[PDB]
Paper text:
The DNA sliding clamp proliferating cell nuclear antigen (PCNA) is an essential co-factor for many eukaryotic DNA metabolic enzymes. PCNA is loaded around DNA by the ATP-dependent clamp loader replication factor C (RFC), which acts at single-stranded (ss)/double-stranded DNA (dsDNA) junctions harboring a recessed 3’ end (3’ ss/dsDNA junctions) and at DNA nicks. RFC is composed of four small AAA+ subunits, Rfc2-5, and one large AAA+ subunit, Rfc1, which assemble head-to-tail into a two-tiered partially open ring structure. To illuminate the loading mechanism we have investigated the structure of RFC:PCNA bound to ATPγS and 3’ ss/dsDNA junctions or nicked DNA using cryogenic electron microscopy.
In class 3, PCNA is fully closed and resembles structures of PCNA alone and in complex with RFC in an inactive state. Compared to the open state, the PCNAA and PCNAC protomers in the closed state rotate inward as rigid bodies in a planar fashion by 15° and 25°, respectively. In the closed state, the α4 loop bends down and is sandwiched between the AAA+ domain of Rfc5 and the N-terminus of Rfc2. Binding to RFC:PCNA partially melts the double-stranded region of the DNA near the junction and we resolve density for unpaired bases on the primer strand that extend into an opening between the AAA + domains of Rfc1 and Rfc4 that is continuous with the bulk solvent. The last paired base of the double-stranded region of the primer strand binds to the side chain of Rfc1-Trp638, which serves a role analogous to the separation pin of helicases.
Residue numbers in the entry:
A (entry chain B): 4 to 321
B (entry chain C): 7 to 336
C (entry chain F): -1 to 256
D (entry chain A): 290 to 407, 413 to 786
E (entry chain E): 1 to 354
Amino acid sequence: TLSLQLPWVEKYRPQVLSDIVGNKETIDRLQQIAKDGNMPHMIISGMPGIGKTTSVHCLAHELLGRSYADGVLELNASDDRGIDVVRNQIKHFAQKKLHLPPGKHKIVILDEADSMTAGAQQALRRTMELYSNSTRFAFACNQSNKIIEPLQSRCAILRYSKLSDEDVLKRLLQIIKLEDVKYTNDGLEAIIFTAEGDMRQAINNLQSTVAGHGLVNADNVFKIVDSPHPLIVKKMLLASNLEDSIQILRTDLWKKGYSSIDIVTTSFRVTKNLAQVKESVRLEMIKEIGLTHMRILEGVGTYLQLASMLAKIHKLNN
Amino acid sequence: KRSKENLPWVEKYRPETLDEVYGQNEVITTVRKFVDEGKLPHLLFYGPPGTGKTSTIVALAREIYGKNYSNMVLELNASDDRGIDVVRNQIKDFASTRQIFSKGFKLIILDEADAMTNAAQNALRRVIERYTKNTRFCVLANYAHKLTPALLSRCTRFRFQPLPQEAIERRIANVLVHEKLKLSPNAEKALIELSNGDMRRVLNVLQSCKATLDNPDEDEISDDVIYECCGAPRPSDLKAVLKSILEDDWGTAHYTLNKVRSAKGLALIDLIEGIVKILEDYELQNEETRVHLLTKLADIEYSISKGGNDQIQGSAVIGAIKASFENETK
Amino acid sequence: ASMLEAKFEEASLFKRIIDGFKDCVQLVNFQCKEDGIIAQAVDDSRVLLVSLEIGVEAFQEYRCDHPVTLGMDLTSLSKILRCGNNTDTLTLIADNTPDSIILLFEDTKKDRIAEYSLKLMDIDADFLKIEELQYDSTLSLPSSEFSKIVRDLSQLSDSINIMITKETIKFVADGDIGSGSVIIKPFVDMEHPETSIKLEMDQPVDLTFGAKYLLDIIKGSSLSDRVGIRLSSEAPALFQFDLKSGFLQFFLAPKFND
Amino acid sequence: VVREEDKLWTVKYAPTNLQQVCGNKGSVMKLKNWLANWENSKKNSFKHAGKDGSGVFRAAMLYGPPGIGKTTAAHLVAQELGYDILEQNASDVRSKTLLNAGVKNALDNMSVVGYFKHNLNGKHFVIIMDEVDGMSGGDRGGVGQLAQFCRKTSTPLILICNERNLPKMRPFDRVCLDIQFRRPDANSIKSRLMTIAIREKFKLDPNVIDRLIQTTRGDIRQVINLLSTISTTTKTINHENINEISKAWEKNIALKPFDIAHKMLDGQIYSDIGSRNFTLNDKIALYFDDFDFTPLMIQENYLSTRPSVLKPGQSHLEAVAEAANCISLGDIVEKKIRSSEQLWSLLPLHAVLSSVYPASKVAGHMAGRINFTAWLGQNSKSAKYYRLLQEIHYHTRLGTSTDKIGLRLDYLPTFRKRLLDPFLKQGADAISSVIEVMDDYYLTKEDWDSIMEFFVGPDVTTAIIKKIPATVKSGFTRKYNSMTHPVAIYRT
Amino acid sequence: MSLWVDKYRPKSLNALSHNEELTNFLKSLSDQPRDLPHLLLYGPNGTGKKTRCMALLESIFGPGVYRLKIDVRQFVTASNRKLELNVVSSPYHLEITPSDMGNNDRIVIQELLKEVAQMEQVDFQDSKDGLAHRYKCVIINEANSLTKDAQAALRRTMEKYSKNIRLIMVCDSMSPIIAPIKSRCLLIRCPAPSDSEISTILSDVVTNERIQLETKDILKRIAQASNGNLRVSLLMLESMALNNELALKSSSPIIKPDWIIVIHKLTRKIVKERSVNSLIECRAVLYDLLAHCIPANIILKELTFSLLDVETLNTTNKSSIIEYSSVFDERLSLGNKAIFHLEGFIAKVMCCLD
DNA sequence: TTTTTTCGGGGGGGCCCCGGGG
DNA sequence: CCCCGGGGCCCCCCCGGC
Ligand SMILES: Nc1ncnc2c1ncn2[C@@H]1O[C@H](COP(=O)(O)OP(=O)(O)OP(O)(O)=S)[C@@H](O)[C@H]1O
Ligand SMILES: Nc1ncnc2c1ncn2[C@@H]1O[C@H](COP(=O)(O)OP(=O)(O)OP(O)(O)=S)[C@@H](O)[C@H]1O
Ligand SMILES: Nc1ncnc2c1ncn2[C@@H]1O[C@H](COP(=O)(O)OP(=O)(O)OP(O)(O)=S)[C@@H](O)[C@H]1O
Ligand SMILES: Nc1nc2c(ncn2[C@@H]2O[C@H](COP(=O)(O)OP(=O)(O)O)[C@@H](O)[C@H]2O)c(=O)[nH]1
Ligand SMILES: [Mg+2]
Ligand SMILES: [Mg+2]
Ligand SMILES: [Mg+2]
């Protein structure tokens, strides 16, 4: 079949700021800016799939109305954003003459700005300062640290947080009512639990479950979305008896096709974020995990190495 | 490239249609359902080597486009340059342009995407998002830790399990029928045991076993043929070595290990691995025994991986097992 | 020097033919048979299809016993062809189960022989039938004017939109610095029937194409004084340059309208 | 044409006069005095230093943290004295070729715009090269060209940067008059903040201003931006929203090496409650703030603390030994990372082995001042001496039978007794004999001097050589220079 | 004049005066040099390995092997980094020390040696048998310092072009040599000379140089202090003669190197004071030693053996010291920053002593 | 209160030289 | 026959985890 069904993440992409769930204070501030005007230079940072690009695009659209095509310059990682681009194309756009309503300005949307080089960011400083009377800059990124401090000083920082389960449930129920999707409470709970606050992941998983099995229940959802292996690793590391940990390693991870490198990296991350355990014990476990990781990187990616790592961790925890 | 019979069995038996992919019924059924109703999302296939990821995606491409799929899909792998410039130009042009031949959607297959740099993966995000209406992406991977979270968020994940026993048996039966070969039940059991869920290993070992027979038309492949061609220890050898280590004195154990190894020129690594597999089923009273066994045997394996003195390593294995089991008494 | 022997009386014609599409594709399969040589290639981005045909009237002599497929890298072939003078005949030579192709430049007046060998490559490409389509609009215009228009519009944007309407052909480009639009109308001059612009329209069309691909395509203007453009909605655009015996065709897919 | 209500406050309330700039009054006055006396120094060829000592520098270098007002101060001082400004920034191309083409021709050229506009100094150029820190590159980046121009220029030159303590700024070590801009005090900025709040018609508590200034870390521009964004919706900045505003606008600033070392070696963060507040992830991120120097600082400063995390029965020395062992393991991991395999995925592990774990084993209160790593200079010195040893060894290859290490450990102590001791004992009469030895091994006077520096401990030759009478050394030099000598490596 | 260690160096196999069995074996090797395999001479430093290699070359080819010249070769890395290599060459053999290029030594193996290996000899160098010599000898000094990648590159170069070149490698120890290289070479042990042989050589030098000697016991003491190192013994004899106006007395003390004295002082300080401040001063001393081209491994070995010679320490302390020395010598082998490992070793020793 | 090693990738400055126009 | 535009190498400089 040569036909394609439009993904719901695109079919139901919010078109106004009112349709964005979560981060109520930030969305309210953006709505106030849009209604009033005089948008300042801004940087929006957050985790994947929470509504940063959506928020920026909605703000630009509602601010510029019919002048969106002429007054918005969008550049992302898929485009060229080198020093030459910043020095010529962005500067030309900033210097461009364009009559706008009394309190509107041209907008440069640098999406995924954390991937820009230091030279381009340095070049942007004087362009931002000189033409602030007609152009304003909006950055969207996952890691705000990558933005050089001089740019951060000129921008307003609007940090986004993970969406709560309530907002995810609300959006999922809205989409279900729109699409007439048969569902059960356990299915939605499983979808939300596996999404981990990522709206895009939740919507994609729901659509995949509906396409593959129709009924959105726990069984079908788990048949589509696998159990997060980080939780399996956390269970493995916190097991009381070494036999239980070895059984988990052999049955839930090794026989499921997970590579040793993935297992060791996940173990390192989970041990790092294991606040329940004392810091010194975590440091010892991290040392052992690093030894095993180096051994695996040298090419000995066997199950015996992982079993030995588990045994050493068990000895440490005793 | 004269005929298909001049190819290695791994390539000669590559599945051509989804119906020939075995051991992945869940994934195959789900993807076939997606394709039938035109509801194909962006796909990620994560799995260990030789499970059928590339075969499955190529078969899906054939199912969608037909015999001329090669000119209707954009396939890139680790052997090709997939830098940020390639993503910006070639992938972007393919994703934003109509098909030359047909009027259907466009498929991009990034095989071995875990070898792609972070910059290219980041550049792919907006390409994937912007052209979803007419383009789909398929990513294939063995190591998920090399994939950026942004890319993972945009794809629906399917895990290719290690091939179950039954799929391997059925594929072996097909190969035996095609090649006019006889396989004994014990030989099949040993082949499946040594495969570890990888079809390529099964096919290579079977081809070697066929080459090892004097008269393949009537001669049958037995477990002895498998062990000889693969040069692997027999279960009896492992059991005898373990019994000598656990029940005899140092001199007798050393002599038994040396004699067993020299009888067929076995490798110490294979003996260590087989003994570890055997010991994994033992019911041990004290956990310290298992801890010491695992740690010392892992150390010996790591040392062997870098070379060293074989005799000292074998004596180390014997001593480690003896010392570890000394703790079971009390 | 037994199976395939094809002599170009002028060695520059083959060089021009190769140069017409060497920047579009790299690996090309040449199929040589009794009635001449054919070739089909697809760009790496799979957006452009190049189809070359040369009949036996284009050779001083031509002999092929059985069909032969020669896989070549166009960069190496262009390098070899650049080593021949314009006053030398060029013979292509190939044998049974060939691993190489021999290019022999002969200058009888100076009695100069220059023989080169190019190793063949194994290309798994099956000639895909370019099924004929009843195009909505078909026009023909001098190649030089089309090249000039394409080059001028490529300076403004990376996409060029062609609109065919009753008695009008429009090329439009929109970019960061500005926009441009060139409008032409069918015009016939009996005094000089080489500057004429001919159009036959059945349904108006509007299609956008990448500027880089058009820039690559216009490089075939050195082969013919005229270019024929066939456009139809829901089908690739065909750009044809006619040779003495054969032709060079470019099938370019339009950009998705979204 | 542009309505004043559509302008950013940072533009609306920009300092229009030198007396309107808050803070760094001393640096502004120093710059004013230096630029006002540039002509006087020029008449003296920049030789006679003045009362302030700013008479030997023909170019000023203003540096400080972001947002203090360096650019505005430089521009205003330029205009007040009547000069014409030729300003460049990272938005322009400033490579070797472009620098040699555009700005090189203006360092001694009259200003046509200055001529047409018309003070006695309005026809001259004050070149202001802003954002020099952004001039990415080495020799071709133009940084070296600007350093050279700071040595040769007929008109005043001003360079503005942020991080002067950067390797790329080394060529400017001593070429310019340094001028520091520091985080302005809260009192200086409070008046302007109150004025802006009054004009913008929103409630601002005077006390809250101090917390706001602390949040921005002395960044006036960021303070005004925060004020604008807060007043957008919340016009009542009371004491019930101080925490929320401060936490929403807390700039993420990468700590500097000394600050990283001080924070990592503090014992509070390694306590139960401190660890709960400052987690292990936070410590790893602190390492990642500067992963090239953090391990070096930890190694330098892990023996100069009073621990507060010692275990019952553990002494300071045992904790130090454990930290040293983990530092060695981290060094091995670092070698693994920077190899042909490029195993950068082990970077987090290194963070734990090189910095976090050893610091946690000796964390406490600093028993002094955080010192910069001494390993870099020692490594450079070792490389220099190894190059000298290689040169000496390959000069003496034809006569000796040994490797360079064998030459250092065995031959040189005996060479000393034939090269230096006879001078100390016989005096001038030891000249010829010494040269004879120098001839048998193809030794040059430079080789003699280099050899005389390798010795350590009780055989250091510094004072001994310095004590030789000048006549003996002069005779040695003259006799060496007045004769032909053999050559070993006669490259052609 | 030239130092007595260099002036009296033997120039032929028949001129050797110690380890007669090794001389006979080398003469057997040189009897039919046409099929001579690649050689790897391993032994303690300062024993006469290079002298014996040169003597063997002279026996195979002739005295002309001692006419040595020095040339300079250029190399370019992937980053267009220009590197200089000093090559000691003879009409019959070449000498190279690839460790001088550090991690770039591979290049020397990949380009220089290969270039010599691919080039067939076309010089009519008539030999004793009457037929011209066929292969060109290449000596690799400090072969134990080669990186593993360079050693790997050496393998097929040795195997393929054996007819054109033959390799002679010299090493203090074979532990850093990879197994494939040892498999490809004929291993030759070079034992250190006995005390009697060292005394005989020293007495010969004394009588040749007309040095006043009170008794022959001074030569025995020098040989004992040299610990079997002949170069060290000869240089020490020359230094003592210079310090005593070419008149050695029975009470003349043994002269020790400056770095040895510094290491002994450090050992005494470590044994006396065991604290963090002492550790900081020890770090300063270690930095001073390392800055002046004292290898880290030499420092570790000397420190360990000096500590083991202390008379106050008991058996447990010495056992702990040697265990820590082994561990940290491995760490140095696998590390980059030597000061880190040396400081760790000193801290562990300080903890153990308390 | 100052300043190091390696591949591979990516970026950015600098020519070089073929082609095409006048 | 000579000058100018713009493709292609060549060289050097900086990053690298979550
Ligand atoms: N707050 C949200 N409300 C409604 N839909 C959302 C929201 N966030 C994400 N989505 C949905 O998921 C899709 C993707 O959202 P995005 O705005 O692209 O997330 P993102 O923050 O830009 O992810 P990254 O950082 O670029 S990987 C949207 O089209 C929406 O359909
Ligand atoms: N499910 C399968 N069914 C039948 N044969 C299989 C199957 N999986 C692998 N094989 C066989 O092994 C060969 C390789 O299969 P692939 O599809 O290439 O596995 P793969 O997972 O893509 O390998 P990687 O990830 O590149 S290491 C096929 O040609 C088949 O002959
Ligand atoms: N001392 C100051 N007094 C008053 N306003 C200041 C001061 N410093 C900065 N500002 C405000 O912030 C805006 C920018 O000041 P700048 O002169 O650009 O500081 P800067 O130190 O040069 O910033 P960098 O180093 O280029 S990031 C001014 O227009 C003022 O509105
Ligand atoms: N008289 C005499 N001196 C020797 C002999 N072998 C070595 N030597 C001396 O010992 C010095 C050092 O020997 P060397 O070849 O450098 O030892 P290596 O470091 O192991 O290569 C040489 O300069 C010789 O003078 C020998 O056989 N007889
Ligand atoms: Mg986004
Ligand atoms: Mg595959
Ligand atoms: Mg500034």
